[PDB]
Amino acid sequence: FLTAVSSIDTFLPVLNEAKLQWPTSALAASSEELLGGYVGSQFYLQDGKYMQFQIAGSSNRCELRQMIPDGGSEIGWAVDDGTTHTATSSIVVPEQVDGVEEVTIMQIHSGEAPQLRISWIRSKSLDGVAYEDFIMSTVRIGTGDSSDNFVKTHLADRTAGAMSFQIDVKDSKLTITVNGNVVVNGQDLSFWDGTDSCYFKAGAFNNNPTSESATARIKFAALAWVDHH
Ligand SMILES: O=C(O)[C@H]1O[C@@H](O[C@H]2[C@H](O)[C@H](O)[C@@H](O)O[C@@H]2C(=O)O)[C@@H](O)[C@@H](O)[C@@H]1O
Numbered sequence: 427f428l429t430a431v432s433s434i435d436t437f438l439p440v441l442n443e444a445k446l447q448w449p450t451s452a453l454a455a456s457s458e459e460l461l462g463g464y465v466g467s468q469f470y471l472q473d474g475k476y477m478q479f480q481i482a483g484s485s486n487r488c489e490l491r492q493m494i495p496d497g498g499s500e501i502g503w504a505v506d507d508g509t510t511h512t513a514t515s516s517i518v519v520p521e522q523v524d525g526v527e528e529v530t531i532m533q534i535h536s537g538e539a540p541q542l543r544i545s546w547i548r549s550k551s552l553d554g555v556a557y558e559d560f561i562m563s564t565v566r567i568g569t570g571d572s573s574d575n576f577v578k579t580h581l582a583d584r585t586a587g588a589m590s591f592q593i594d595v596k597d598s599k600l601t602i603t604v605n606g607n608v609v610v611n612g613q614d615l616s617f618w619d620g621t622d623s624c625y626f627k628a629g630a631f632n633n634n635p636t637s638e639s640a641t642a643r644i645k646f647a648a649l650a651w652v653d654h655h
């Protein structure tokens with residue numbers, strides 16, 4: 427078998443507060459299964475050090491979903507509880523194979539919608555400007571489909587090396603730091619005031635591929651979800 431992610435210490439804290447969804451939103455592995463050696467080509471320890479996710483197919487995923495720690499059920503939190511909810515990662519986004527067009531690698535999501543997606547995207551125009559092979563944030567400020575429901579930002583061009591991300595939510599404000607630099611500084615999340623079902627996700631969620639067989643692949647050198655109070 428492939429080497430399991432849980433065979434080293436690095437990812438145990440997040441696996442202790444996650445379930446894996448693969449190849450859809452259906453459950454693939456409970457937290458205890460993840461901590462106890464769950465493995466496959468979709469989710470394995472790569473190069474002795476990366477938690478790697480792989481998935482093909484439109485809207486398919488191999489994704490961790492935040493759970494109450496220590497064998498608890500699904501978590502839900504609010505954007506304005508006075509604490510800071512923080513997700514910190516170090517991600518190697520390799521060159522994506524032909525047919526893969528957008529891969530969501532971290533989220534804040536609730537019962538209804540994604541508050542935030544951080545995604546790799548092959549090419550896109552944002553605010554009249556073309557970008558290629560880059561990392562984007564998409565924040566929902568509404569539940570509709572017109573462009574005014576979203577705030578989209580160029581976070582960074584994709585690098586060969588690991589790229590760090592920190593997502594901080596405090597007092598209905600979102601901050602995204604990339605390689606130690608604040609990129610998104612206090613984006614308003616007030617539309618979500620009253621929602622108590624938010625949670626973090628991370629992995630690979632394949633969006634709008636041009637081929638159903640093309641496999642998205644994303645490597646995490648680090649991932650942690652914490653609440654600072
Ligand atoms: O046409 C789009 O690509 C549309 O998608 C929106 O993101 C959605 C994702 O693609 C996934 O379907 C899932 O995560 O739901 C997302 C959503 O409904 O917010 C946005 O990227 C939007 O800007 C875009 O028009």
Ligand SMILES: O=C(O)[C@H]1O[C@@H](O[C@H]2[C@H](O)[C@H](O)[C@H](O)O[C@@H]2C(=O)O)[C@@H](O)[C@@H](O)[C@@H]1O
Pocket residue numbers: 447451452453491500535
């Ligand atoms: O598939 C979706 O549209 C969303 O489902 C969410 O996962 C749910 C889902 O109901 C599962 O069947 C399971 O029973 O509970 C999941 C949960 O963790 O809340 C999310 O995967 C979400 O990202 C999807 O957009």
